[PDB]
Every structure is written in C-alpha cells, then in structure tokens.
Design a protein around this ligand. Sequence first.
Ligand code: BO2
Ligand code: BO2
Ligand code: CL
Ligand code: CL
Ligand code: MG
Ligand code: MG
Ligand code: MG
Ligand code: MG
Lengths: 196, 204, 241, 250, 244, 243, 231, 222
Amino acid sequence: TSIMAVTFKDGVILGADSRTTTGAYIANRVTDKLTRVHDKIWCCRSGSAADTQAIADIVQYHLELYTSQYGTPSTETAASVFKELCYENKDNLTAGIIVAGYDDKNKGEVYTIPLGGSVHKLPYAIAGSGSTFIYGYCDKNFRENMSKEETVDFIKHSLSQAIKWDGSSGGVIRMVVLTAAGVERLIFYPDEYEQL
Amino acid sequence: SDPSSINGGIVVAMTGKDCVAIACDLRLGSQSLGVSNKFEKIFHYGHVFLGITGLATDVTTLNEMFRYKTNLYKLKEERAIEPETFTQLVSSSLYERRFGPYFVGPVVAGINSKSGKPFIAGFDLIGCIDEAKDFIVSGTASDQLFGMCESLYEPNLEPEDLFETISQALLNAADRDALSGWGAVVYIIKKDEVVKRYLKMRQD
Amino acid sequence: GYDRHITIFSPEGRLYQVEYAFKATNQTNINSLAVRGKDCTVVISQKKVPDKLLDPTTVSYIFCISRTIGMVVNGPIPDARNAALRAKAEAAEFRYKYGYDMPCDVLAKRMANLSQIYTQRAYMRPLGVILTFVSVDEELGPSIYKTDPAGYYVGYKATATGPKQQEITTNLENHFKKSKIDHINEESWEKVVEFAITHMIDALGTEFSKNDLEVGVATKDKFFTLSAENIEERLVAIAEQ
Amino acid sequence: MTDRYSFSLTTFSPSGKLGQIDYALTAVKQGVTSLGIKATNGVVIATEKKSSSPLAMSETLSKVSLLTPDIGAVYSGMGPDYRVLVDKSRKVAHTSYKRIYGEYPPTKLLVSEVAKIMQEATQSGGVRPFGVSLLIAGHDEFNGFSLYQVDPSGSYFPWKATAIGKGSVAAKTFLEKRWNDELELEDAIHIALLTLKESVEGEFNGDTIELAIIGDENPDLLGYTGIPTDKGPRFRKLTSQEINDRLEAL
Amino acid sequence: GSRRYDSRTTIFSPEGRLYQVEYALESISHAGTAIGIMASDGIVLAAERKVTSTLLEQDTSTEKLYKLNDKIAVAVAGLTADAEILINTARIHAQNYLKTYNEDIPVEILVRRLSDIKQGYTQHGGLRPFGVSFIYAGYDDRYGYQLYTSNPSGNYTGWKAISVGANTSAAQTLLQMDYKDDMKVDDAIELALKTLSKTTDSSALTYDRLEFATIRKGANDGEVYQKIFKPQEIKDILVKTGIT
Amino acid sequence: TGYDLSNSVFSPDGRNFQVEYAVKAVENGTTSIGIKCNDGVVFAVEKLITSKLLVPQKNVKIQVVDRHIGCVYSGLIPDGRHLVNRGREEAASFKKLYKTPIPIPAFADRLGQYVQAHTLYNSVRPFGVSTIFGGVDKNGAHLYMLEPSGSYWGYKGAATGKGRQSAKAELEKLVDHHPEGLSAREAVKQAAKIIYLAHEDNKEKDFELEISWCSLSETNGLHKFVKGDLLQEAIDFAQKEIN
Amino acid sequence: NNYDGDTVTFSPTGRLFQVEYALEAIKQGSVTVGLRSNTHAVLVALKRNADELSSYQKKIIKCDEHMGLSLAGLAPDARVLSNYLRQQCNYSSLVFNRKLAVERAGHLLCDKAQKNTQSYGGRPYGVGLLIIGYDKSGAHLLEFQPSGNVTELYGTAIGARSQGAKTYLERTLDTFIKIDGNPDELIKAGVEAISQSLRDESLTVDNLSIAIVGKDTPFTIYDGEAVAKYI
Amino acid sequence: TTIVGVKFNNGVVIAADTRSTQGPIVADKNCAKLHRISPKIWCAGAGTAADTEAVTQLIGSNIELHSLYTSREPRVVSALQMLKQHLFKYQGHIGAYLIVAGVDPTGSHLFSIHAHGSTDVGYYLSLGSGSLAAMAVLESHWKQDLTKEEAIKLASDAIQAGIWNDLGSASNVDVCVMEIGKDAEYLRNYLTPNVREEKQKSYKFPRGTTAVLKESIVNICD
Ligand SMILES: *[B]([O])([O])[C]([C][C]([C])[C])[N]C(=O)[C]([C]C1=[C][C]=[C][C]=[C]1)[N]C(=O)C1=[C]N=[C][C]=N1
Ligand SMILES: *[B]([O])([O])[C]([C][C]([C])[C])[N]C(=O)[C]([C]C1=[C][C]=[C][C]=[C]1)[N]C(=O)C1=[C]N=[C][C]=N1
Ligand SMILES: [Cl-]
Ligand SMILES: [Cl-]
Ligand SMILES: [Mg+2]
Ligand SMILES: [Mg+2]
Ligand SMILES: [Mg+2]
Ligand SMILES: [Mg+2]
C-alpha cells in the first residue's frame, strides 16, 4: 500500500494506489483506499482492509451523529475519533490511517495515525508498505503552500516510485482534492505515471 | 486424541424404488480395545430414521436430544415430523454449537408420509446438509464406503435388492477398517413397513 | 382512581394519561402546517418570542434530524428535544446498520413504536408532543408523516397541528378539493413556501412579519431551515400579488 | 430510573374478574368492525379503512398485514397495539420456527405464539394488556386453511366465520345465516362485502375497504423462478379496483 | 414511587387466607365444569365447553382437554391462556425427566412440579396467580391409573372421581352417590356424562358443547392409549348412554 | 385529584404539578443573574448573610464547568451541585472523544436532557433549581437559563430567584439602551447594580456579592472569578446607584 | 401532610418534608459546639446518657490526623458519614500524597447526602455534623446539614438549645478568632459557649467531650479526667 | 470452489460450480452454492459450507423482517452491511467468502465479502480455489457494456476454467440472473456434462448373497 496526504495553498489532497493483496496474489487491482467519513473529511487506509473498513464505518457514524447535534465537525475532531478507536483497540487492530480534511477556518489539515494509535499533525504524510521507498524523495521535494497542479504532480511522482519498488502497491493512482470549491476525484493510469 | 475416531463405527444410507435403507456396524471401542458389539447407531423418531457415527457419548446425547425435540414437536404440531423437516432440525441443532460442536456424523433416512418420496441426508459435525439422491456415508471407514457405494450402487433398486447392495457396501468397507465391524444392522424402510436385519460378519 | 395516573385501562377502555398528553401538545399555543410540492416538502410553524430577553435565534421547534429528514414539534420544548435527540440517534444507527439513509416514514414508525411502549409500560410516561416528520424520500418522493402520544402515525398529503389545526385543516381540505391533486403543483420550493404561508394567513386570519414565522424545507438529498431574511423575501413576494 | 413496576397491573377482583382484560375487551368493542370467513379453497379477512382525516393517505395505513407468505392478520381495537403485535408476530415466526425448521410455521402455532405474547402482557409486571382482538387467517400443508380469533386475555378460538368490534353481534348473526361448508372463495368474498356494508356508515368502496385473502399460490408474486417447490405466497391483498369490480356484482 | 399502585398479590388476610388465590378460585367457579373418573381398567375425562356458537370450528378447537405426554393428560378449568403457559412447562418437564432417566415421568412427580410453580406465584414475585385448576389423568407402572387436581394455591390431591369448575358441589355429590370401586371405564363414561347433564347450566347437553377423552390399557397388550374424542365420537357416545 | 402527589403524572390540564412545585423551591431561593456582553458573559449571585459567623468569600456558589463555562443557580443548592457534577462528566466525555472543549449550546442540551429525564419517572424528584450558565466557544459568547422542567433558551440577560422580577426589569432596560452591545467590564458593573437592586426582595438580612465572567478579551475565553479591586470597583458602582 | 410519605415528593409550597423531619432529629440531639481561631479549631460536645447506670454516648469522631467531626442526631448515620470521610481523606493520601482539604471534604459530604434526598426508597441522613480541620489554608470549621447544605463558619452550634451557644459565639466573634497559639483559651471559649445551652444539668467529668486540631496539633479527643481541667 | 459474478448493462449474473470436498475426497457432486437472501438478491459462497449456508439464511431472515418493517424492497447494500458486520464480529472464524449480487430500487450491484469482513466492488469478481483460473478468463475476455447473453457466457466460461484446471472445482454450473424490472431466474445446472459413461458391468447381486442372522418387523406406528 502506498498512501499519502498533502496540504497546499487551497486545501489538501489525498492520494493512494489501488492494490489489495493476499500474499503475492492481487485480490483487487482497482481498490478505493480513499474513503469518506464526512463531506470534506476523508481518510487514507493502510493495513488490514477489514479493520480499516470497520473503523471508517464507525467514524462515519460518529461524525454523522455529531453533525446532527453540533454541526460540521473539525478535521481534528475526526482524527480524535479515529485515534480513540485505534488506541483503545490496539491489541486487536492492524490499521495505519491518514486523516485529511478541509475547514474554511483551518483550511487543509493532515493527521496521521500509525499502528500504536498515536496522532501526528503534519504538513504532509506518507504511509503504507510502499512509503518506505519515498521518504527521501518526498522530504526533498515537498514545499509548503504549493499550487493544486504542483501538489498533484508531487503526489503523482511520489506514488509512482512507491508503486515501482513496492510489490504490495500498484494499479491506478487515485486522488481526492479537498478545497472550498468542493470535492474533486482524480485518477491516473499506469501508462501515464510509469513513464515519469 | 481425534474425537471422531476414538470409538469407531460407520453408517451408510441408500435410496431405492419407493424405499430407503440405512445400515450401521455394532462396534464400540476405546481405540484398539473392543468394548461392545451391541452398540447400535441407528435410531428412529416416528417414521424418520437417524444414524449417528463419531464420539459415542455425543451419539447417545444427540439421540436423547432429538427424541426430546421430536416428542414436543408431535405434541404441538399434532403430527409426526417428516424427514425434510427433521433434517433442518438436525442442522439447526448442530450449528448452535458452532464453536463447541458435537463430534458426530449424522445421517437421516426415511420416506415422506404425504408425498411418498424417499429421502436421505448427511451432515458434517456442525450442520452442513448433504442431501444426496443416491447414497450417504459416515464414519471411520467413509472412504471405503464411498468406494463401495460409488461402484455397487445403481438407481431404482427394489427393497430386497437394495438390501444386498447396502449390506455388501457396509460389510466390505468395515472389513478394511480396524475400528469398524463387530456386527451390523440393516434397516429396510417402506412407506408403511420396516424390516430390521442383523448381518453375520467376521468378528475381528 | 389510579387508572387516571398511569397508563392502564379505565372501565371505558380509555387511557387518560395518553389523552392528557394530547392536551399538553397545545401548551405552547403554536400552529404548524406541512404541505408537499412536486420536488419538495415544506413545513411552516408559528414563532412566538414573548420575552425581549430571549435570544430569538435559539427559539425553535423545527429540527434537522438527518441530512434528508426534518422534524417540527407541537408541544413543550423539553419533550420536543427528547424526541429530537432520539430520532437523530435512530436515524444515524439505521444508516450504520443497513447501509442507507433512514426513510421519513420508517423513522416515524420507529418513533411511533417507542410512543406506543410508553402507553403500555407503566413506568414510562408519554411525551406530550406531536412529531411531524418531513423529507423528499428517494423512493416515495415528498413525504409528510406525523406521530402522536398514542403511538399512532400516518402519511399525509398535507397536515396541520396546534390549537387552530381545524381551521387550517379545512382551509387545506378545500384547496385540494379544487385542485384534485395530492400536492402543490409548483416547480420551485420558494413558491411552495409562499403557498404554505398564504394559506396559513387565510386560515388563521393573521398577518405575519419575518420574525413571526419559522420555515423548514425538504428537497432531494437535503433538509434546511430558512433564515429571517429568506422568509422576508417570501413575504414580500406574497404582498406584491 | 429502572422499571420499578415489577408487580402485576392486572389482578383478580373479589368477583373473579380480571378487570384490565375486561376493559381491554371494551376497547375492542369500540373499535371498527373487522371480520373473517373461511371457504373450502380459501379464507377472507376484511375491515373498514376508517380514515381519521380526508387529508390523510389511508393507503399508508395497513389494517390488514402479511405475517408469513401464507398467513395474514386483521384487527379491531387500538391500532398502535396491533402494529407492534404484527412486528413481534413476524419476528417470532422466524426466531421460534423458521430458523429452526427451515419452513414457515403453521397457522395454529403462530397464533399460539401471538397468544402467548398477549397472555404475558396480562400477567407480567408493569404492563397493561393489549387492547386488540386479532383475526388471523392462514394456510399450511397439513392443516389446510384456518381462521383464528385472538383476544386480549391470550385466548384463541378457531372459527368457520366470525366478526369482531363495533357491529360484531349483528355481523355474526348475518354470517350464521349465510355460511355453509361448501362456500368457494369468491362466495366468501361476496358474503364478506355484504356483511361489512351493514356496519359502514359513509363511503363504501375499494378505497374505504381493506380486504385480503388466503387462497391459491401466487407464483407471479414470488419474485424469482428456478425452484419448482417454491410456488409463491397464498396471502394476497385485494386492490382497490379488484374490490370495486365485486361491488358491482353485489 | 411505584409502591402506590402495588396490589400486593402475595399477602395473607387477617383470617389467614390468600386473597388472590381465593378470588382466582371464584373465577374458576364460573368456568365450564370438568370431570375426571378413575376406573380399574382406565380413566375418563369429560368437560363442558362454555356457551359456544354454531360458527365455532369445533373439530380443530381445544379449550379443555390437553395432552402432556403419551401417558398423561389434563382437563382445564379457568383462564385458557394461563393454562397453556403451564401446559407447555409441564410438557418440557416430562421431556427433561425422560432425557435424564430414560424413563417416562411418574404422574405425581409432574403434578408436584406444576403445583410447585403455582405455589411460587402465591409466595413471591408480586405477580397474580394462574387462574387455573387442572384435573390430571395419567398412568405409570408404579401406581397405575391416577387422578389428581391442582388449583391456584399450588395444593394438589389424589382422587377416585373429581370435578372442577362450575357446580362442583352438585357434581361431587352426584359422583359420590353412584361411584363404586369395582367400576369400569364404560360405566365411568356413563357416570361422567350423566353428572354433566344434570349440573349443566345449559338447557341440554349436546356434542358441540363437550370435550371428551379416555386413558385406557385398552391398547393392544401391556401399554396405554390416550383417546381424545372427535366431535362425531362424542355424538355417538351421547346416543349410546341415552342422553340424546 | 391526586395528580400532584406523583412525579411524571399528567394532570387533566396536561401539567406536571411536581415540576411546578419544584419551581416554588426555585422562587424561594436567592437571586442570581446572567448578562451576555460583547465577547463573553457575566454571572452574579446574591449570597444571604444568615449570620456574622459566616466566613466572608468562602461559601462560593458559582461553579466552573471545564475551563470555559460558568454555572450559577437559585433554589436547592445541593440539587444545583448535583447538576454541575453531571455537567462536568458530560463536558469531560465530550472533550475525551471529540478533543475540542464542549460548545455552550451542546453543553446546554446535556443539562437539559438530564433535567428533563427527572420529569419522566415517579422514582425520581425534579430538580429544585433554575440554572443560569454559559461561556465562550468557537462561535462566540452564549448565555442560557435552565428550568426544573428541562426547558432552556438562549438569553441576552437572565434572572431567577426571589428578586427575579426586579432583576428582569433592569435587564430589559440594558437591552433597550444598548442595542450595539455591552462591554465585559460594563457588564460586571451592571451585574453588581442589578443584584443590589434585586436585594430589596430579600432586604431583611444583608448579603455578599459574588461575580464571575468569561470574556474573549478580558479572560482569554476562560471562566474566572471577579476578585479584589475589580470586585470592589463594581460594589462601589452598585452602592452609588442605589443611593 | 400528603407530601411527607417519602423524600421524592415536593409539597405545594416547594418543601421536602422528609428532609425537614430529618432536620428535626438533629434538634432532638444533644448540643455540640464548634469554633476556631487562625491557628486552632475546637469541637466541644455535650454527651448524653440513657440513665445513671449507662455510659455517655460519644459525640466526636476522628477522620484523619488533621480532620474530624462532632455529631448531633442519629449516631449510626454519623458513623456512616464519618466512615465515608475517613475513606475520602485516605484516598487523597494514598493516591495523591495529599491531605484532603476541609472545604473539599464538605463538598463530598454535601453530594453524598444529596443523593439520598432525590431518590426513591432511601431516606435522608438523620444527623448534623460539625467538621473541624487544619489544612494548607489554615484552620477550618464546617456545619453539615442532612439536607445537603454545608457551610464554612468561624463558630457555630447544633442540637437542642443550640441557639444560646450560637448567640454567644456571635457576640464573642471578634475575641475568639484572635486566640492564636493558645489552645487552652480557645477550648475555654468553647466550654463557655456550650454552657449557654445548658439547663438543669451542668458540665461533669464524664459529661463533657472536647476535641482540637491545629498547626502542630493532630486531631485528638479529650474525655474523662482529661477535660476536668476545663470544668 | 469456483464462484463468479459479472455485471451487465441492465443487471448482474452470478455463477458457481457444484463440488464439495473433505480433503481429497468428494462429499457432494452437486452442491448448490447459490443462495437466496431475498427474491432479487442472491449470493454465491465458498469456504466452510455450513458457515456460508448459516450466515446467508440468518441475514436473509433479517432482510425479510426488515423489508416487512419498512414496507420496501430490500437493498443489496443492506445485505452487504449486515453480512460484513457479522463476519467481522467473529474475526474470520466463520469461514464464509461470498459474492453478493442483486437488483433493487437503486439499480444493480455486485460485491464480494471475505471471512474477516472486508468488502470489494467490481464489474467482475471471483472467489474460491478455482478463482485464479476464472479470473484469468475474466481478465482476458471481459469488456464493459456486456449483454445479458454475453455476461452469462463469460461467467460460465470462468466457472469452466475452475472446473477443468482446479481440483477443488468440478461437475455442473449453476447460474442466477438478476435483471432490472424482471424476476430473477435461478438456473440450477445450467450446464452439465452430457452423456457420461455407463459402467461396464452391473454389480446387482444374487438375492440371498448376504448372510443374515436375525429378522424382525419394526414398529414405527403409534
Ligand atoms: B495495503 O497493502 O496496506 C492494503 C491496504 C488495504 C486498505 C486495502 N492492505 C492489504 O492489501 C492487506 C494485506 C496487507 C499488505 C501489506 C501490508 C499490510 C496488509 N490485505 C487485506 O487486508 C486483504 C487481503 N485479501 C482479502 C481481504 N483483505
Ligand atoms: B469450496 O471449495 O469453497 C466449497 C464451498 C461450498 C461447499 C460451501 N467448500 C467446501 O467444499 C468445504 C471445504 C472444506 C473442507 C474442510 C474444512 C472446511 C472447508 N467443504 C465443506 O465445508 C464440507 C462440506 N460437506 C461436508 C464437510 N465439509
Ligand atoms: Cl478496501
Ligand atoms: Cl420498533
Ligand atoms: Mg508494484
Ligand atoms: Mg474391522
Ligand atoms: Mg480385531
Ligand atoms: Mg406509562
């Protein structure tokens, strides 16, 4: 799995590959690892597909009920609900989640929640088995306040390399753009990103 | 150690023309030690017959359980249970112990009293229904029984021909199994008469 | 005479606590009205802020249960909010368990069943409220379903609730006798709200300012309440014809 | 909190009467008339859709309810009590039968389960009896067609034909004169419509009358093909048009 | 709190009587009469259905006589719904005993069990007692043919002949007059129907107002057969004994 | 009759007389008020000096919930404390799950639902307090008042207790004479005056003034007690106005 | 009248009669006095005997090395409440290595008593308590009522004829508050205060019970010949 | 086991083989691996036979009750959600691997569920021991905008790949077609091997061949 979330000038963009594996067999080559817990709060999922789905479903339920009572939740609040589930059930879960969302007040925010259940607010985050191979590249190429087009290129190039080297990663590169304008879905096929 | 092969034993059932047959060996042992040669594994609740292989304590327990349940069924429904319905009851009852199962291999046999249709069914230790047209096998010599039944069996056998086929299936299968034998019983079942025959076989 | 204190049968076969809960319904002295358009369901309710010390923005009997479902309440606010919180919880749980948004009629039934339980179980009192649920259902379209303290519920073409419900009901009845259709034949929700307000004015015989009303609108995939300025625009259009 | 009413609210009076059951029966008496007639090849159950308002859509309120594919129910008395009983009756048909035997319960046993629930509300702590009388019509393979009445006490009786509620005394007398053991389903429906007209004041048509039957298997209503033994539900609710057609031959 | 509305179903009167038991017995006294008569070669159970209708489906109807197992049956007097609760419990107890000991339950043991359940509702729980009286007719290999009765108090007693429900005072006098120890089933059948015919509040005793049953060793060789009479069979025995 | 002997029983009117009797306990209590200002809220309460033996400034009535909400109440003091303890549990579990401090409207409903729950059963008694509370959240300042029935609304100014009519009249003047708004420091002064004016209903015994406030500019949106010079400044302003 | 059958019922004027009846049990109880300075806090209690053969019922209970109370009313209820205080004082020490504040001790007693006034089945406590203590903010004196009301005071008295001692303390307020670094004089003032509540009987050696806590003085109770000094 | 699901333009088709095995032994040569959850929602199951049957009926029961409660046609996402949450609860110990398909008022749907509770979406799917043979066929011949007739062929070709090449798959092909607007058609044994060998010799025995010791009539009657 190769997932990442990157904040930029107009908001935040989530990115992910589409490969699901059972050992060396690719059980699904067109997986959607970018999932929606609220209108403008999404997450990237890595680890157990069953665990991360169950968690995401519970979070979506909590934020739906939150919204009914207290209005739109913050991205920080969403990350806290993820954390609470991942931390309290750390013995029985295998989930590495990146939470990304857009407020008008706070703009683009990214929170990463690794195996332990700890929370880390960052300008950008990378996770999944394929992330290991792009720590060097991403650290060298990331800039704050990038444009939409620059951020799309950054994620596209980064996940391209992660896919290239990691056997657990592959398929298409999915992306979700979160801004004041709305929610935009992007997709990039092998023929495009392999030649980069 | 393996609960399904401590006591030993086998059951086989076959369909014929307007008849069914169900048979079993009589052995009960403690591994190598033969203990009883009168341990019958076939029971009946009304016109529905149930054979049970596997761990003997569970064979006994399940018999007592299905007697219990079929007796209440009859009091409430004001009629005897049918093979198709009993089959679903056996499956339900086994699966409720999904993660602490009875170590058994049940076999249902009988004729539907209303339609007259012959019926047989087999189960695994946790409820999966194998509703075969031809035959059902169960026990420590199930492999042997499969081979015998698959080669000997032909459809639409008459009651007295079916008796010969099922008896020879059981006998020759049991004789290739160390934990089966020590006697045998065959039930021939028709819509309103049932004959029970004890077979003469080698006692080793 | 303890058959009048708890929910058990009187000799007449009546439940007096249920009947007295119906009377609590009109304690607020507010009238509500719900009508259906082509693409929308509109609910209006009288807004009365008698105290100048009150923050008028917090005075409301219309609730956003889910994204799709809205609910107006006729009765005291504590019981109203009790019902609202439960309906929100039930709607959220439904979506989690069954994978799709709870329909308006199903929620109404669920709340009606809960109400029924209070009429049968002695330790629980009935809520002194009448709940009017509105949405644009993805299967049934524009929907109005109303629940009461007896545990009764039913779908409506249009409905009215409050002290002067009968005057509003007859006014609406007479209109639908003319048009011979089960809804307001209008494209925009703005004009359906104008219809709703106009017919409440005619029925009650009172004029309204922007702060005298409270409006809720259900469209496909969302329910929302109108601001005072949105209502003012609505009142201006009514006056100009 | 906690339900602190752990004692019976229904008790024997000095005369031996169970007051709350009697009063529940009084509530049933006030209820709208419903009836049931058993034919040789089917059963019919019927009642009046007493609309509380002309603005109310009476189609959304179902007085006649499917319990199983071969069993239906109608009532007289308190609607909300009926509605929750139908929910429980539907569920108990699965939990206490279908999930055990892999088939739907026979009419008498489902009736028995419903009766049990109603009896418990007559004895358990902190509850009143249900204020309804049910008429449950159904079919099963070994008992054939049947029609049962279930009272607030939990008592149930099988009927050839009967009526409950408002004008039950008059309706039962009307049914006694008309009923015989050679009625076909269409004849029973005809008698049902005649009997029901007497107790109805206002409009009498397909939109103000609710009527269902337990009759032949409906493979068109099954929803799928490919299994010969599955032939479709015997329960069928008559449409507004289907009722009006028979009101012309009335 | 809740105390205000508590009837207190399990208390003594100043005289040392249980109010609710006494009032439940008063309820039962208005129920259709049921009679049990024990003979040397079998037992008879007869009972009167309460003011029936012509539209009642009698052949599928059961309000008085119930089967507990193959050897034991009961005649009911009181609230039918209450009785069915207890009947299902009794049926289960018999099956539990059978599963445990691999023998049919002795009649008294089953009767004691049900009677103990009834007793519990009079001493604890704060619930109303079961408004039911049973006549138990059964057979086992220890005592042979047995008749028992139990009432809402949970007290049970054994009988040669007994009635419950309406007009028991009149019925018990008539049984005490014509009953003899060397009596047989066919004679007991006649006594049962004659007693009902005299004690009935109806104008005449007919087949459609009766439930009838016999427990006979009149089953092929050493075994017992229960016979729940069908409407036509009740009609025939009424003609045979000379009542209709 | 007998409808007033048990809680959660509807009278033939549709009223819950037990809740109405709880209100009588509230009306019997000392005066407490709340004033919503430009960027926050101000709470004040009348503390009756029953005796000279009472230690001044020790028997504190106003209570903090979390770090941004102030609560004051009139009526049965223990009931008010019980309600605040619950409020603190509610605020803690909200912050535990959602990270952010509980918003004031959200907090208001938590108390509201809890008080309303005590009108649902005969096994509990309604609360013998009307609670005035509020504070500053992400959406700004909020002031609420919560009755024994569970009923609550947002307020510009609020008052309860024995001198509520007097106080209300004073609050209404401020609302009329300051449509643009009132500053936090002004509200503290006015709060002191209103309690002094409302003390005419409890004029037998002398009293002690207690004031608190949350303000975005003055207290960084945290609840704090008005102490020392600022308190004395408000007392002087109040004493000047009554004379 | 009709509204005094249980604690869960308000009267039409908003009164809780069961609580008021519990308050009445305190008035029947024997007099006890509490008073403090800035350095020390003192309890003085008039113990009551059944007859001449009987012992004199103990009125003072130690809760911790720095805290304790005197009782008036149902003694078993005081035992329950004092036991609760002992546990709370003890929890504070074991968990936080912190001596429990006297004010916080009062808050805990208030909340415990309150639960008994709002719930069905239970009953209010039938006892009044005077809690003294010395913590990080100096000497303290609290008055507990089973309604839940707890009040911090310079001095007070509860029980039968307690109004006489309370008036005396109200006059002496300016004097006894200044008695700093002199335990014997503070006790004298307390013994003189409780004397204003006596009729017919006088303070004897097995009648009088005194307790004290202060800056360098653990909570200690004086009975028997230890209080003869003050008679 | 080889099970498949294929979407087509106006619906969805499901398919499966008919072999059940205990190790290397064949237990049933004609097992029905296609199940009805609701009239127009069917699922194919692989893994532990008893678990697929039981979890399919339980959710089928709850779906029926839900349909009655809501007065609506049941949805496929409802079955999907109820199933996965149950499987997740038991952390994979209920060995049910399913392909769920159907039509409802929202349209036509195709999903898969693994024993641990993870769900997937696709136009074509396969599970079981023969899943790799089938997916190779599907990945070679699938195109979008299939007709009902093309999709059935693709599905049954995929099932054949498993039958021939996978030892855990054998015998006949079952199919079910769920089209929008239409009734679902369950095609039990859509494909069977034709003809088949007659055995060389009948092994019917001479009567009296088997030696008997005792005989008796059994009393089944009451
Ligand atoms: B990715 O590789 O982490 C991916 C993300 C997931 C949300 C789809 N996980 C998987 O593919 C996992 C295995 C795994 C691989 C590498 C690291 C951690 C885990 N697969 C599954 O959970 C799975 C596989 N087959 C069927 C069902 N679920
Ligand atoms: B298929 O291979 O997935 C098939 C699916 C269908 C039959 C439900 N599974 C099986 O045939 C399984 C294989 C298996 C063997 C042993 C343990 C678990 C699974 N067979 C059975 O479940 C089975 C069937 N009948 C009797 C015994 N076991
Ligand atoms: Cl996934
Ligand atoms: Cl419900
Ligand atoms: Mg790769
Ligand atoms: Mg051998
Ligand atoms: Mg040997
Ligand atoms: Mg109630």
